[PDB]
């Protein structure tokens, strides 16, 4: 919250962190920060502290063979209810020990073989208390401890805080499993988000929820996973989550065999191949994120009120160089870490391999293990400023800086669609400080996500899939589309087209509609927005406290007030 | 840890809170902290933010009726697994926004109606699926279900830190219920910590657990639970607790119909009474301790080599007040404090009362609610530089002052046995610094807990147990007993033997024995001491990687290196 305690302790050590950051990173990179020509994310954290920002769980590996978790020597679960336990703690665990966003990728085959042993037991119990109808004993119990095992999941990662006071900030992928173990994971998690949290069944923010969509697996009538489809479909609708990733769009932008889950938001790694030529995915993680304000660029190669294309070429060359400058100071901080620093990542598992306590851990990072995010924003406003459209252009030529700093470096440097959930606003209010209101810029308050077309713009949804759907082939690092709709709940078909459309075009993508619920009378029809707040259509209720109103107005779910 | 990250972080906010004492606490007593007349505890955490120290939690209101957890509306537990699984998520919670020890008491009792609806659904499952022995499914099912859930808390509460980046500093007390669901629980936590921790089955050093001995309960041969009190002589015996606590002389001292728990490692509440009457316990807590270094008034008495009780006299005072000053000084802090600073506590149950966000936290400490700890330490010490016993003398004086303090504000002091892990080291520094070696007081390097007999004694369990009982009766605010005793693993009946002796004169008990475990060959004999570390007397390992040896050389289980 804010003047709760875990989070007063939190703020002390950001400032402190602050501060021992003003000393270590060069003065240039710092007034470039403080002046909003570039963004240095987490810097409340890094490079104080040698921490690293998201990364996808090698939870299959943790959990197969031993591992050691607080004071306590973790052995292989025995029943998937105490496999989410584990994952649970796993996920508290690991969230403290980075800034940024925990993955548990393809869940449905990970836990699988735990489903598998829940179900060996009710078979043995079904012979040891002779039980008529066996087969149908042992399906029904398993089919309840499933659902409880992710009721526990959902719960405990809404109950507990990591180090920073706050709940963790956590996604979970799945879709790929076709298995009737992996089938029944993924019914058992779009019912519990479906079902809400807590006496009222509220909308969760976390976790993200992500499902994979494929020919042959989930996408068309004939599909065998094509009712957990309209599962996914009705739980879009109630709870906004889950996301898609188009299968086929994801492994030929990131050269994977299997689709790509991202790490946190949408950070994607590519495809990366350990020293016997498998290709490995969980582990991985991502060291930072830098974020370049494209618009600021243009108002400073503003001559009057006149754009200068020769400036604009000057200062982007120059910025690239800087922001190359900023990421490799952090990555630099690294030097000399030992694996001391978070046993859980590099000692026991987390990230893939296990690392004795006096190794570096830069070296787990280097030669295109981790990826390392140079972040953008604002190609609407950029477009608006320079004339024309130039995102797919600017884009690409910052792709080719990347490839020369990554074979300069060995790190896998990638561009990346900034969330940018707050910077929206903050890279404006300093290009306010600087130009004042700028028409269609800086006049509304905010810069628009990435390569998003504006949020202010009429257009259909088929539309903006298009418009949009270039930029996930170019901005491989990380990046989304989504779609502004109504009321859905009733119209399930119109919210497939959308997800055919959008899985045939682009790699990641998701549907912004409104989901509220009325606690005294229960509608779940779109409230309508008064200058007070909130106001129930059918009965008339005003109190925040007896509603749960959720948008997705950027990046993560919230109640917009 | 202390390169682990949420550690470095916690240093990072404990170091801004000592130095924000630095502005809020008066000079005087800051000196005096400093120089060792006093140790004001918990600096790094108080009073720069409004924490509190230790609690009784209030579990059975916050389980019963609803409350709210993280973003989480949490309803009635429809289960054991699920009860316990929630009383972990407020082990952490509780710990994050309070600098001392959390304690559930009578977890058998609380838990009890739990078990309860685990069993009726387990009945409910014997007639839907037509099983032969209906009576004998559902009591098998429900032992492996509470086994389970007590076994899910203990890994819990060993794989999740709190805020502060450690495990949480937790105890568990059971022992007066006789019901069957009740001695269930008794026995499933009992063989939970036989088993031990992990792959490997070691001692945790968390949960305590304190178990409660009365006539007509576990007692003596014909009790009921008599068979329970045998599974404790032998969890004693491998894993050191249960500490016990004798019902009778426990009701005595704090004048309290039921048997009362210690909050962390042993503070207790008195009697205290709702404006209804009823005598509550759960949600009771501590308000922070202040140590009086007794050793320290006498040596500052001494004019050359000589005591002169005149001056003990004038100091004893001047700095009895002085105690009075910092206490009072840190509870001042608390003042328009509002339960937003923490609603697990203060809003949610954890308190045992709710507040409004909008409400003052302090109004709740208060007319004797809240106990506060004026602690001491170094009888024996004392003893030895005024060259008489006056422990019971002058801890009764030290009583008359507290009668005053508590009659002047409303908040009930109490004299509290300071456990004092590491300041006895403090101390005896600091006064080293000022006397040098003292012979029989400083030249050892350490002061002695309280008012217990010399570690350094030829005494027996017995002798000891006399000595020390009368303390127990006078330092009401917290008080233990050890004694030091060989392998009885296979001496059950000379352990239950001081059991009984301790249970009759004295009120809070524990033994300390050698449990150590070599794993290469499986001996749980008593390792034998060398200058390099340990070595095993049957096969002659002596790597630490390939051991477990655990002593409570003080306060906490530790391996001593
Ligand atoms: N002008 C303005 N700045 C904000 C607001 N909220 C946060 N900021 C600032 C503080 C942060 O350094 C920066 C970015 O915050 P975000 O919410 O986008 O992400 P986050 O809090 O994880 O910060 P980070 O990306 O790690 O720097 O913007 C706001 O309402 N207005
Ligand atoms: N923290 C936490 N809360 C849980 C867990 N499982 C359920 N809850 C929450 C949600 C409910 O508000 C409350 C009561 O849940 P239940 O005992 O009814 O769990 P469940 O639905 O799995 O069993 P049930 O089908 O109702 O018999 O506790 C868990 O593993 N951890
Ligand atoms: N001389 C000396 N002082 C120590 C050692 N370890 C800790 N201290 C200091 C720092 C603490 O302020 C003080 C008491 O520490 P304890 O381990 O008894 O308890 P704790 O860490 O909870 O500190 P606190 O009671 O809150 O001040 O003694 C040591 O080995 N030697
Ligand atoms: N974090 C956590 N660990 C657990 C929990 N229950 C068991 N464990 C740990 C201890 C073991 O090293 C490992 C495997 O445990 P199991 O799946 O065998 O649990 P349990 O003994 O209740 O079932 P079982 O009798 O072996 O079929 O996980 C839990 O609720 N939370
Ligand atoms: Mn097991
Ligand atoms: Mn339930
Ligand atoms: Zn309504
Ligand atoms: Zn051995």
Chains 1, 2 share one sequence.
């Not at 890279?427 to 810069?447: H, I, N, P, Q, R």
Request: with cysteine; aromatic share 10%.
């Amino acid at each position: 919250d804010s003047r709760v305690f875990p989070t007063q302790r939190d703020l002390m050590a950001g400032i402190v962190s602050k501060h021992i950051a003003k000393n270590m990173v060069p003065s240039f990179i710092m007034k470039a920060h403080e002046s909003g020509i570039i963004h240095v994310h987490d810097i409340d954290y890094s490079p104080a502290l040698p921490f690293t920002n998201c990364c996808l769980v090698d939870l299959k590996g943790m959990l197969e063979n031993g591992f050691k978790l607080g004071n306590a020597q973790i052995e292989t679960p025995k029943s998937i209810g105490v496999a989410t336990a584990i994952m649970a703690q796993i996920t508290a665990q690991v969230a403290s020990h980075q800034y940024g966003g925990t993955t548990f990728a393809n869940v449905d085959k990970v836990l699988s073989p735990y489903v598998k042993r829940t179900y060996a037991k009710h078979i043995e119990d079904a012979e040891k208390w002779q039980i008529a109808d066996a087969l149908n004993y042992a399906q029904s119990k398993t089919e309840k401890d499933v659902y409880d095992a992710f009721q526990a999941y959902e719960y405990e990662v809404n109950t507990l805080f990591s180090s920073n006071g706050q709940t963790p900030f956590v996604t979970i992928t799945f879709g790929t499993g076709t298995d009737w173990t992996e089938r029944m994971i993924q019914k058992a998690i779009l019912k519990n988000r479906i079902k809400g949290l807590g006496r009222d069944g509220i909308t969760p923010i976390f976790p993200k929820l992500v499902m994979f969509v494929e020919e042959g697996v989930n996408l068309y009538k004939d599909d065998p996973n094509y009712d957990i489809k309209q599962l996914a479909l009705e739980c879009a609708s109630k709870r906004m989550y889950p996301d898609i990733i188009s299968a086929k769009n994801n492994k030929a932008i990131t050269g994977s065999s299997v689709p790509v889950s991202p790490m946190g938001c949408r950070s994607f790694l590519s495809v990366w191949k350990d020293s016997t030529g498998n290709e490995i995915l969980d582990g991985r993680n991502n060291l930072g994120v830098v974020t370049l304000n494209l618009p600021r660029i243009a108002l400073d190669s503003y001559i009057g009120t006149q754009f200068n294309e020769q400036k604009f070429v000057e200062l982007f060359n120059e910025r690239m160089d800087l922001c190359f400058e900023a990421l490799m100071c952090r990555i630099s901080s690294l030097k000399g870490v030992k694996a001391t620093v978070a046993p859980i990542l590099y000692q026991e598992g987390a990230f893939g391999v296990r690392l004795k306590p006096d190794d570096d851990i830069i070296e787990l990072f280097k030669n295109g293990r981790s990826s390392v995010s140079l972040g953008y924003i604002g190609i609407h406003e950029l477009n608006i400023l320079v004339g024309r459209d130039i995102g797919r252009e600017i884009l690409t030529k910052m792709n080719a800086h990347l490839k020369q700093w990554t074979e300069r470096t060995g790190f896998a440097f990638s561009l990346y669609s900034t969330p940018a959930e707050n910077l929206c606003y903050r890279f404006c209010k300093l290009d306010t400080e600087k130009y004042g209101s700028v028409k269609d810029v800086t006049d509304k308050g905010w810069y628009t996500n990435s390569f998003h077309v504006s949020v202010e713009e009429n257009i259909t949804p088929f539309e903006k899939i298009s418009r949009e759907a270039p930029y996930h082939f170019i901005a491989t690092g990380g990046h989304i589309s989504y779609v502004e709709l109504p009321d859905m709940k009733n119209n399930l078909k119109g919210l497939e087209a959308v997800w055919d459309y959008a899985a045939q075009h682009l790699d990641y993508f998701g549907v912004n509609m409104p989901v509220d619920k009325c606690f005294t009378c229960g509608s779940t029809h779109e409230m309508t927005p008064t200058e007070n707040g909130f106001v129930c259509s059918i009965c008339g209720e005003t109190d925040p406290k007896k509603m749960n109103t959720i948008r997705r107005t950027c990046a993560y779910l919230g109640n917009p007030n």
